[PDB]
Amino acid sequence: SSFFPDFGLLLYLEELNKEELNTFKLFLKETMEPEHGLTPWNEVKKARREDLANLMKKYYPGEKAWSVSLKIFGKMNRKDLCERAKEEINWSAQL
């Protein structure tokens, strides 16, 4: 359902350790620029996880914030997260 934007993004950010979260922010900067410009980066680079999930949903509404994060997990080699997402999305659609 609507689980993934409402709850999913934050839950997955919580599976990132401190170093991985910094890697995530850099991938996010790289994907948001130059289209979104330089304004969001100031929010991003100081945001804790809950704050990061919220600000992503401003620029990437609904499932878009979730979709952007998943691609980043794959690029940063957190393939365990990509696999869990597959499992969850596939089960949910079967409901």
Residue numbers in the entry: 7 to 101
Describing publication, verbatim:
The introduced positive charge of Arg84 bridges the negative charges of the opposing Glu26 and Asp86. This structure further confirms the proposed adaptive role of the hydrophobic residues Trp72, Leu76 and Leu87 that contribute to the hydrophobic core and thereby stabilize helix α6 within the bundle. With this crystal structure analysis we have identified a conformational regulation element (CRE) that allows us to predict the tendency of pyrin domains to adopt the closed or open conformation. Our previous structure-derived conclusions on the significance of the charge bridge/CRE suggested that the L84R mutant should adopt a stable six-helix bundle conformation. The L84R variant adopts a canonical death-domain fold with all six helices contributing to the stabilizing hydrophobic core. In quantitative terms, the hydrophobic core in the canonical six-helix bundle form (L84R) amounts to 2435 Å2, whereas the corresponding contact area will be reduced in the wild-type protein by approximately 490 Å2 to 1945 Å2, i.e. an approximate 20% reduction in the stabilizing interaction interface. By contrast, the L84R mutant crystallized in space group P21212 with one (monomeric) molecule per asymmetric unit. While the engineered L84R mutant showed remarkable properties such as a drastically improved thermal stability that correlates with a strictly monomeric six-α-helix structure, the naturally occurring D86V mutant behaved very much like the wild-type protein despite its severe physiological implications.
Here, crystal structures of human NLRP14 pyrin-domain variants are reported. Structurally, NLRPs share a conserved tripartite domain architecture consisting of an N-terminal pyrin domain, a central NACHT domain (with reference to its initial identification in NAIP, CIITA, Het-E and TP1) and a C-terminal leucine-rich repeat (LRR) domain. The death-domain fold consists of six antiparallel α-helices packed around a highly conserved hydrophobic core with Greek-key topology.
